[PDB]
Curated annotation (Swiss-Prot):
Disruption phenotype: Viable, but defective in sporulation, white color. Strong induction of disulfide reductase (trxB) and thioredoxin-2 (trxC) that is not further induced by diamide. Acts as a SigR constitutive mutant. A double sigR-rsrA mutant sporulates normally but is more sensitive to diamide. A redox-regulated anti-sigma factor for extracytoplasmic function (ECF) sigma factor SigR, and a key sensor of disulfide stress. Holds SigR, its cognate ECF sigma factor, in an inactive form, inhibiting its sigma activity under reducing but not oxidizing conditions; oxidation and reduction of the anti-sigma factor is reversible. Mycothiol (MSH) is competent for reduction of RsrA, allowing it to bind to SigR. In conjunction with its cognate sigma factor SigR may sense the intracellular level of reduced MSH. Probably releases SigR during oxidative stress. Residues 97-108 have a biased composition (Low complexity). GO terms for biological process: detection of redox state; response to redox state; sporulation; sporulation resulting in formation of a cellular spore. It comes from the Bacteria. Disulfide bonds join C14-C47. It comes from Streptomyces coelicolor (strain ATCC BAA-471 / A3(2) / M145). This is Anti-sigma factor RsrA. Interacts with cognate sigma factor SigR under reducing but not oxiding conditions. Treatment with the thiol-oxidzing agent diamide inhibits the interaction, while incubation with thioredoxin (trxA) stimulates the interaction. The keyword Isomerase does not apply. Belongs to the zinc-associated anti-sigma factor (ZAS) superfamily. Under oxidizing conditions up to 3 disulfide bonds are formed. A single disulfide bond inhibits binding to SigR. Residues 36-50 are annotated as: Contributes to redox-sensitivity. The keyword Lipoprotein does not apply.
Amino acid sequence: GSHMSAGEPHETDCSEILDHLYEFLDKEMPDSDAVKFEHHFEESSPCLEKYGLEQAVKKLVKRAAGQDDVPGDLRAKVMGRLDLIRSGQSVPEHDVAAAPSSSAPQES
């Protein structure tokens, strides 16, 4: 495992963390959620290390009130990812939203 690594640690639940990412993000306060996110997002880091949501949710938390708040491009990307996660495992290069390097950074 030098270039490719998919060794997830010992976890328990994950869909529930997504469940927040969806209703938390869309049915609570898109901008007033980055600071409230971190709390629940840190309790289940291993869930975000299954499909690669850590990298994304960290970015959602990064905005917070006052800053980027919510470009709609991260959420739509995260929610749509939940919908992909909850209904699949194959994930795309969504890291491009904040430093592209999911699999092929350059991709010739």
